[PDB]
Amino acid sequence: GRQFGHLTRVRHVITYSLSPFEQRAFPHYFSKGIPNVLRRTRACILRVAPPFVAFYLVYTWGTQEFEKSKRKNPA
Amino acid sequence: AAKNVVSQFVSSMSASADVLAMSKIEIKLSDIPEGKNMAFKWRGKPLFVRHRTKKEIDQEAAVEVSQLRDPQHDLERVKKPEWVILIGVCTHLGCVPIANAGDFGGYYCPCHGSHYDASGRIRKGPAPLNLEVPSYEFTSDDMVIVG
Amino acid sequence: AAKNVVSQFVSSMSASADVLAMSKIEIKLSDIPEGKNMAFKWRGKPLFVRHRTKKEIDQEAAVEVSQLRDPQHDLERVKKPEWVILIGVCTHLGCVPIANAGDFGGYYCPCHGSHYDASGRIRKGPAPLNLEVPSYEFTSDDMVIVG
Amino acid sequence: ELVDPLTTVREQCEQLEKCVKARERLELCDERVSSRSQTEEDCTEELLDFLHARDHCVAHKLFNSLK
Amino acid sequence: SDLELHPPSYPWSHRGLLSSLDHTSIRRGFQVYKQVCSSCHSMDYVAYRHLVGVCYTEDEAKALAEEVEVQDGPNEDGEMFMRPGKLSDYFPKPYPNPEAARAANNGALPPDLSYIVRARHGGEDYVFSLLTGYCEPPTGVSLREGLYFNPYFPGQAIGMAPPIYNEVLEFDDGTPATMSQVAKDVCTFLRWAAEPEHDHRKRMGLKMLLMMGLLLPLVYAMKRHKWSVLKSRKLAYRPPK
Amino acid sequence: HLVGVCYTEDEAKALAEEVEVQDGPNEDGEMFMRPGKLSDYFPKPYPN
Amino acid sequence: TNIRKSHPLMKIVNNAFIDLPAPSNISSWWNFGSLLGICLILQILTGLFLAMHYTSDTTTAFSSVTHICRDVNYGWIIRYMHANGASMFFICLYMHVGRGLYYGSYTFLETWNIGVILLLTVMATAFMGYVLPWGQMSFWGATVITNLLSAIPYIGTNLVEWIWGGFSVDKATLTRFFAFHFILPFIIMAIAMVHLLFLHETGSNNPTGISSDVDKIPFHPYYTIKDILGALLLILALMLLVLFAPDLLGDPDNYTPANPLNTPPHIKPEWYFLFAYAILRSIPNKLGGVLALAFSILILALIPLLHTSKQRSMMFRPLSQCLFWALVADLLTLTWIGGQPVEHPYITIGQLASVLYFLLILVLMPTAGTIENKLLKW
Amino acid sequence: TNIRKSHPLMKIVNNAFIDLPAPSNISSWWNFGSLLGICLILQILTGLFLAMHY
Amino acid sequence: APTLTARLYSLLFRRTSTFALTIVVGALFFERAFDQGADAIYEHINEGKLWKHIKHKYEN
Numbered sequence A: 001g002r003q004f005g006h007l008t009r010v011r012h013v014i015t016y017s018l019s020p021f022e023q024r025a026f027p028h029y030f031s032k033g034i035p036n037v038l039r040r041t042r043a044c045i046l047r048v049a050p051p052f053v054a055f056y057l058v059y060t061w062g063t064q065e066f067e068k069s070k071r072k073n074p075a
Numbered sequence B, C: 001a002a003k004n005v006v007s008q009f010v011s012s013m014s015a016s017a018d019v020l021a022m023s024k025i026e027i028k029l030s031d032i033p034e035g036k037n038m039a040f041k042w043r044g045k046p047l048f049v050r051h052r053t054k055k056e057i058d059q060e061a062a063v064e065v066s067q068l069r070d071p072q073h074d075l076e077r078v079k080k081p082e083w084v085i086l087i088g089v090c091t092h093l094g095c096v097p098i099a100n101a102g103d104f105g106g107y108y109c110p111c112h113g114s115h116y117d118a119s120g121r122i123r124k125g126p127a128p129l130n131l132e133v134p135s136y137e138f139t140s141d142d143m144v145i146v147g
Numbered sequence D: 001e002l003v004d005p006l007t008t009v010r011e012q013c014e015q016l017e018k019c020v021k022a023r024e025r026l027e028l029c030d031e032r033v034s035s036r037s038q039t040e041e042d043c044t045e046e047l048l049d050f051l052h053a054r055d056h057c058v059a060h061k062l063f064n065s066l067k
Numbered sequence E: 001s002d003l004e005l006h007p008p009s010y011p012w013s014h015r016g017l018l019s020s021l022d023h024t025s026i027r028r029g030f031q032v033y034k035q036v037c038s039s040c041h042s043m044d045y046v047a048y049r050h051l052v053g054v055c056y057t058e059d060e061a062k063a064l065a066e067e068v069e070v071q072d073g074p075n076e077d078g079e080m081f082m083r084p085g086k087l088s089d090y091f092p093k094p095y096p097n098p099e100a101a102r103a104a105n106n107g108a109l110p111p112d113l114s115y116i117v118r119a120r121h122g123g124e125d126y127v128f129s130l131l132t133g134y135c136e137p138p139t140g141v142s143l144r145e146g147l148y149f150n151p152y153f154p155g156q157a158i159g160m161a162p163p164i165y166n167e168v169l170e171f172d173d174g175t176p177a178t179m180s181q182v183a184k185d186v187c188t189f190l191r192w193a194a195e196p197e198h199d200h201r202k203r204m205g206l207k208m209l210l211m212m213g214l215l216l217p218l219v220y221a222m223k224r225h226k227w228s229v230l231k232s233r234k235l236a237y238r239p240p241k
Numbered sequence F: 001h002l003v004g005v006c007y008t009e010d011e012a013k014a015l016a017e018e019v020e021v022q023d024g025p026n027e028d029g030e031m032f033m034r035p036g037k038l039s040d041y042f043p044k045p046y047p048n
Numbered sequence G: 001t002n003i004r005k006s007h008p009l010m011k012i013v014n015n016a017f018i019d020l021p022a023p024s025n026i027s028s029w030w031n032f033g034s035l036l037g038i039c040l041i042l043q044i045l046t047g048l049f050l051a052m053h054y055t056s057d058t059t060t061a062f063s064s065v066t067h068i069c070r071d072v073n074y075g076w077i078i079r080y081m082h083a084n085g086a087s088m089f090f091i092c093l094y095m096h097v098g099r100g101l102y103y104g105s106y107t108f109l110e111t112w113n114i115g116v117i118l119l120l121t122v123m124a125t126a127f128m129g130y131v132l133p134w135g136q137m138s139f140w141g142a143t144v145i146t147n148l149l150s151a152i153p154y155i156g157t158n159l160v161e162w163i164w165g166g167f168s169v170d171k172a173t174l175t176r177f178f179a180f181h182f183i184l185p186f187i188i189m190a191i192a193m194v195h196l197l198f199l200h201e202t203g204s205n206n207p208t209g210i211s212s213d214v215d216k217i218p219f220h221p222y223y224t225i226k227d228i229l230g231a232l233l234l235i236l237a238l239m240l241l242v243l244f245a246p247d248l249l250g251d252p253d254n255y256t257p258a259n260p261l262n263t264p265p266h267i268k269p270e271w272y273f274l275f276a277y278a279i280l281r282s283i284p285n286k287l288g289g290v291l292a293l294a295f296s297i298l299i300l301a302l303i304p305l306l307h308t309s310k311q312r313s314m315m316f317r318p319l320s321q322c323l324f325w326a327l328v329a330d331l332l333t334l335t336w337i338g339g340q341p342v343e344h345p346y347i348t349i350g351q352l353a354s355v356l357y358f359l360l361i362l363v364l365m366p367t368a369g370t371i372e373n374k375l376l377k378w
Numbered sequence H: 001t002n003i004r005k006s007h008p009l010m011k012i013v014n015n016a017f018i019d020l021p022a023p024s025n026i027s028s029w030w031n032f033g034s035l036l037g038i039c040l041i042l043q044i045l046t047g048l049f050l051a052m053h054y
Numbered sequence I: 001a002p003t004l005t006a007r008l009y010s011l012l013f014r015r016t017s018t019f020a021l022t023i024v025v026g027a028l029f030f031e032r033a034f035d036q037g038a039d040a041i042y043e044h045i046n047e048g049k050l051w052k053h054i055k056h057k058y059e060n
């Protein structure tokens, strides 16, 4: 159905690309990758974490409460 | 023609002639001791026989049918006082309750946590009805026949 | 990796550990009267033990071996002239030869019409080889142990 | 004679700090239940409480003796 | 009661990721099963031919199999008879049906031991603690006749008497026959019986780890090589004023 | 299978009750003999 | 000129796989849909080799499976691969659904609804497979699901009896379950062809949620190599489970033969249904519980109708992201609760979790969408 | 206009069973193609119902 | 040309038929090498436990 050639109209855009045998596959895999990963993690942690922290708290409280309930009481 | 052929194909999946297998069974009551529940096979289902003690009879007669979802007196479901015959199939989805458990000393179905009292009446859980009471009759105070 | 996994899958369809099951068997010679062909089960297949008469022995001895498709003299296929022991599986496509049938008083395979003589040698039809003679030995005048 | 390592390992384990309190409470429960005139009290929880701590330590050092 | 006791984690010789079973312990545990546990329990899915190449040779396995009467038939007259066992025969059952088993043990059915390790939460730990857990009942607690106290069994009341004690069996290799030693040996044999594919599984796992550790970076590098063209291009927007 | 073909239910029941068939185990693990019922197959004359 | 672009049969493959325009920025979450393509075929292969040694007779089913484990050459490998492939399939399936929900892929209504059909079919196939070993959990799961239809008024008992083929679970049930388990994966593959067909017309989505006609690249060689890498990682995880922990995700109780009389005291289903088992246990009412179970799965069909935001994807919608992760945590809570006995305090926690689940899906997400619409002034 | 012609799924049915140009004079010997498919579906249904009790 | 990779390219990897021939020969030798190495490692880790280590004691 959809094929290359008339998917959309584009004008005045130039693209430069380099052959895969003229360049490295791992340019800066440790010097620059790790700061980017830290940036992404810092961005996402505040959105993703608090629900799972709350689940952890509920899990601990429920397990402790069940264990306390099972044990017998004096009198 | 279409209705006839579709009806034949649907009916082929129903129970076959050989898998009906309806017959009676005899249980000797001398073997069962006091304060114990026993199970037997019947139609590929359990069959609970409980020799209730006098304390259970005293305890379960001190309740009112209004609280019970299914109104039924204890004395109506038994042809003798110290004997209870029931079909051991939970009325919620068919699990087998475990004897001498739950918060009422009767039966406890653990698939979804349904409590039946000693007579076999639902008290706390999603089970609509009580445990069924199949037709049965004694010949003496020694044996029983279920059918 | 691909070779290993495909090899394991192919090897799964071969014979399993519980079906290899080699064994032996004992047969009572005195139970087979002269002229009768007795069939037994050995390794999941028929085993023929035929008591031959003097006439049959001499007739097989007169066979011109050079004209046979699978040349063998009668005396190198049996230990005692009066007893011929053969695997009852047609060498063509595996059918069972029928005793006392065919044009040579031996066997006849009706699946495709193979004719064998009283020594089990192929004489007519499509079968390429003479019936297989298993390993066996006589433990006494009355018993034979095949293995 | 023959002596299993298990008895010696258990006796060495039971002289640890953690199990002493559990055994003390087990003995107190025993005293209360035995001295009582009549009750449904049952010192099963204290026995298992003692045994869990006693068998935590045995697992570390038992298999060295066993060949 | 509703109380439960989690068994501790013992350091079994095969506890490791790549560690395999010790075959001498399998041999001793088989002897323990044969001379003690075979009177009551059953082991239905194990044959004498399986012992060959694990802890016995063909001659020893045939000698073990020949010490059993197995019923076979019919003969030529149409009658069933007895014969010595073969390597193809499964271990003999102790009882012919569950009712006979229940009759000889006060209504308790001895379970089949062919998967008891896999059928319980704890595996070898549960069986080892069960076989070495009997003690006097706690104070102020009763129990039926024909039952014995065992804190590791659910309900803390079991219908099996203590099976193993000192000098119950004499091992062939001169090992001391202590309670713990016998328990360890039978537990190892039960582990083998439940999972005969233990050693071949771990052998294959080692090769799988090495091959995957080799194959991951190469395929990753191929993907990086292909995608480097897209990951480094640039775009410029040059409108015609 | 005979019921409603050539015999009534009572006739076929009496026919089943004219022979003895094996059943069990009982509570002792023993086999025993009982009268036939409608669900029993025709007795084999030989065991094998 | 080129045979690839003009042959009747290769043209379909060319337009489907080789020359397909795809977005240039789809992340790894788009691989799971391909992985579900692999796992299905894997289950068709390994299972087809288990059918050559399985017998559906009730007296010789457990024994046949143990024969497969013990006697068939490398049969244990095939058995445990087929066993753990279900867990891998369901992990991939839930990741696929979460990907579709987060990035607003549900606006493709046809593909979304066909996927819902596929989800139901795969759930049925997985349940019918688990009965064929004929252990304890097999028996007491078949019983419960068959009785689940008894809640329908006036026809429940008759339908239950018809499905059982008798008065209980017995040989006929096992044989027909075997037949359905054999045949249903082919129907699943046939429906998956339509799942792909309806997606071919509209193209694929990207994380930004913005139309990507300006930036397109061919599917080959860019997403074939990513498919190979994802398949390699999948095979690594599956073989880790098979070779280093064959029974981590299983249940011990299914290693005992089926007993119609006794019932284990800690019955539970497989890990990928527990959340439903948490919902049904919450309501103390039979018909209400069954309806809640059905609606908890069929609420995915109403997700497209509740969309109220101007932006397709949650990439730029922080409140929607917070609510989405709250929903995921709640599903994890229900999965934890479903594996516990019905007792205090787990009953209250399960009821609150079910209420929170339905409230989050139905009420809070459209409200957050409308609030975010008002914040952006449109 | 016509949804029978434009819907992605119905175009296959239309271009295979409805609007397919066919010769006006094909005799009864061209009927066995469809009868083979009727037979194949009959065997699949009957066989599937036989596998429930085999 | 002095470099190893240049020799490998100019000798083997130019054509695809030679590439395939190299692949199959490499697989043929790598199978045996990997099998021997893995078996050696597995035998060393579990020395004195496998059947073949205790085989000599019992068979005469």
Ligand code: HEC
Residues within 6 Å of the ligand: E033, E036, E037, E039, E040, E041, E105, E108, E109, E110, E111, E116, E120, E127, E130, E131, E153, E157, E158, E159, E160, E161, E163, E164, E186
């Ligand atoms: C008869 C004298 C027995 C011998 C000898 C052994 N066992 Fe046994 N065992 C027996 C019975 C009657 C039962 C059932 C008891 C019950 O309460 O149900 C058992 C049970 C076991 C179990 C099952 C434990 C469980 O949690 O289900 C195990 C694991 C077991 N027995 C182990 C075992 C071993 C290793 C034995 C040889 C040393 C052995 N048993 C001998 C009866 C008898």
Ligand code: HEM
Residues within 6 Å of the ligand: G040, G043, G044, G047, G048, G050, G051, G054, G065, G079, G082, G083, G085, G086, G089, G125, G126, G129, G130, G131, G132, G133, G181, G182, G185, G188
């Ligand atoms: C999407 C496809 C499939 C899925 C998700 C699936 C799932 C399952 C599951 C979860 C089990 C239970 C295994 C266990 O608990 O041990 C199982 C068993 C089984 N499956 Fe499948 N299955 C699929 C396809 C097939 C096919 C196509 C066949 C045969 C043609 C098949 C044959 C079997 C058999 C024979 C068993 C029982 C044997 C055993 O226990 O290993 N399956 N399946």
Ligand code: HEM
Residues within 6 Å of the ligand: G029, G030, G031, G032, G033, G034, G036, G037, G040, G096, G097, G100, G104, G105, G106, G108, G111, G112, G114, G115, G116, G118, G119, G122, G188, G192, G195, G196, G199, G203, G204, G205, G206, G300
């Ligand atoms: C066996 C079942 C399924 C299979 C084999 C399958 C396979 C696929 C494949 C191959 C794709 C294209 C590749 C991709 O987008 O990742 C896809 C896309 C998609 N699938 Fe599935 N799928 C299945 C189930 C489902 C389910 C259950 C849903 C939703 C409830 C679903 C919804 C979607 C959507 C929305 C897309 C398009 C995603 C997008 O481009 O935004 N599918 N599926």
Ligand code: HEM
Residues within 6 Å of the ligand: H040, H043, H044, H047, H048, H050, H051, H054
């Ligand atoms: C092209 C399709 C098929 C053909 C031509 C075919 C043909 C046959 C034939 C000739 C028999 C022998 C019947 C007899 O002698 O009693 C048979 C038996 C059988 N077929 Fe098929 N079959 C087909 C498809 C199927 C399918 C799809 C299934 C199941 C999914 C199936 C299941 C069976 C079974 C269970 C039997 C054994 C019962 C019997 O002997 O009647 N068949 N089939």
Ligand SMILES: Cc1c(-c2ccc(Cc3ccc(OC(F)(F)F)cc3)cc2)[nH]c2cc(Cl)ccc2c1=O
Residues within 6 Å of the ligand: B111, G120, G121, G123, G124, G127, G137, G140, G141, G142, G144, G145, G267, G268, G269, G273, G276, G277, G280
């Ligand atoms: C609720 C419930 C389940 C359960 C079973 C299945 C599902 C999911 C499902 C739903 C429908 C379905 O069929 C359909 F797809 F519609 F054809 C197939 C699977 C969810 C939960 N399984 C249990 C298994 C044991 Cl052993 C005991 C009790 C429970 C228990 O109470």
Ligand code: FES
Residues within 6 Å of the ligand: B090, B091, B092, B093, B094, B095, B109, B110, B111, B112, B113, B114, B125, B126, B127
């Ligand atoms: S099945 Fe009995 S309470 Fe649900």
Ligand code: FES
Residues within 6 Å of the ligand: C090, C091, C092, C093, C094, C095, C096, C109, C110, C111, C112, C113, C114, C125, C126, C127
């Ligand atoms: S099979 Fe014997 S002659 Fe062909």
